[PDB]
């Protein structure tokens, strides 16, 4: 017996993958913000 709804499962896997990638990108943006904040406050200190 083959898979009942193959395209649905494939789309679900792709959704999980690109959701994880979007999470990684958002965290990268947050880290860039944090590092530039630290870099500019170090000079004031």
């Amino acid at each position: 017996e083959s898979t009942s709804d193959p395209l649905a499962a494939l789309d679900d896997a792709i959704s999980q993958i690109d959701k994880f990638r979007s999470s990684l990108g958002a965290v990268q943006n947050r880290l860039d913000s944090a590092v530039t904040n630290l870099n500019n406050t170090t000079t004031n200190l």
């Binding site: 913000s33 530039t36 904040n37 500019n40 406050t41 004031n44 200190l45």
Partner: protein, 50 residues
């Protein structure tokens, strides 16, 4: 002379305190601008999602 030197030392210390306050203000401004960047990005993302 003692009154004079007391006033002078006080003025010097006050100038130092003012410089310190300026540094504090600069740090707070940096933090506020960092928050402003994210606020603008949320603005653009909401415009995209509208």
């Amino acid at each position: 002379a003692n009154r004079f030197t007391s006033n002078i030392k006080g003025l010097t210390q006050a100038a130092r305190n003012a410089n310190d306050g300026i540094s504090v203000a600069q740090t707070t401004e940096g933090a506020l601008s960092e928050i402003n960047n994210n606020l603008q990005r949320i603005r653009e993302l909401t415009v995209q999602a509208s």
